[PDB]
Write a protein that binds this ligand. Structure first.
Ligand code: JJM
Ligand code: JJM
Ligand code: CL
Ligand code: MG
Ligand code: MG
Ligand code: MG
Ligand code: MG
Lengths: 194, 194
């Protein structure tokens, strides 16, 4: 039934633009919406990737590897899956493995790759692939992994046991001013609910 | 160690604004970011998203989801029921109300998250994730009455919790819908548990 009629640029930065979207409602009436988009999306099947990195080690419980960074939009520190935007011509899988190594030091193995999923669809068109990666933490490459962050990127790695992830997250939120990412929290809730 | 120095208004619409954030990086260098905010926030968060666990005896437990046209996306999305928190509403109350409006179901609060960020490299948007159980055998949830507002048009999609990830993948392959990242994350963790 519904569809876009027009998209009008309101304002365009270096990284983000705001648009006035006109669309057709299912009753047949024209309506508008204010839409956010990134300026950096070319032919990628998505803007970015987030990596679900399952750290596996003999005689250890599996960990989920997370990153903590300052997020200017939020005015504070956030705990998130490792993530970045997909470079032009780069596959979601390569992006995921590359970002994971850059942000964490770990060299993963692809497990699965989602279709493009929407970040906040009442607001933006932004999409990612969620890439599940296993990390063989018994491999020498992953022994004392060092982040290789880019210029102006500053990241702390936090590995939490999968079998207690929601409580460990809650305990971190209790001890500091920090925000957990909604995807991380969703994943931790399902681990509990399962 | 990092913090916000100033925020410059770039553009303000009715619903969304775009700002240029200046912040101190940990090296003591000053840096900028483009940040999106909603103009509607006061509340602990912009919105709520409901994880609605439909429980009917002798049936699989279902997660109740919604499908709607999303003008930013230019298409249809499958999401947790959700909406913005009304001024002076509790997150729990916003959760029950949205769940009723969007699905017709009347549910019970199980747990409620802290405020969690939607896309923190882009926006300051936050939600509470509220886990709600729905006693699908009660008479009030027999023929659920969705009471949605002016211009909302929602379809309800219940999927079994124990196969959620494979059911979503299917809807994407066949219906060309975009699944929400939080929904997808939850689904992944149901599979990844143990
Ligand atoms: C339920 C309802 C009725 C009529 C209009 C709206 N509009 C919006 N609701 C939420 N976010 C919005 C907008 C428009 N832009 N952005 C970003 C909502
Ligand atoms: C790694 C790096 C170095 C230098 C600049 C950037 N900037 C950004 N990266 C991603 N999204 C962004 C921005 C600025 N605004 N928004 C929204 C990133
Ligand atoms: Cl539950
Ligand atoms: Mg990143
Ligand atoms: Mg990065
Ligand atoms: Mg809604
Ligand atoms: Mg609503």
């Amino acid at each position: 039934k519904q569809y876009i009629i027009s998209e009008e640029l309101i304002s365009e930065g270096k990284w983000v633009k705001l648009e006035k979207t006109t669309y057709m409602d299912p009753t047949g009436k024209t309506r508008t919406w204010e839409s956010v988009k990134r300026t950096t999306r070319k032919e990628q099947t998505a803007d970015g990737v987030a990596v679900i990195p399952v750290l596996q080690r003999t005689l250890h419980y599996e960990c989920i590897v997370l990153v903590k960074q300052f997020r200017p939009p939020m005015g504070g520190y956030c705990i998130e899956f490792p993530a970045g935007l997909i470079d032009d011509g780069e596959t979601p899988e390569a992006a995921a493995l590359r970002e994971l190594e850059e942000e964490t030091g770990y060299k993963g193995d692809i497990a699965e790759c989602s279709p493009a999923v929407c970040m906040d669809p009442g607001l933006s068109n932004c999409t990612i692939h969620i890439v599940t990666v296993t990390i063989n933490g018994d491999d020498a490459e992953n022994a004392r992994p060092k982040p290789k962050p880019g210029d102006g990127e500053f990241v702390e790695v936090i590995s939490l046991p999968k079998n207690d992830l929601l409580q460990r997250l809650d305990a971190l939120v209790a001890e500091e001013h920090l925000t957990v990412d909604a995807r991380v929290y969703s994943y931790a809730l399902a681990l509990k609910h399962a």
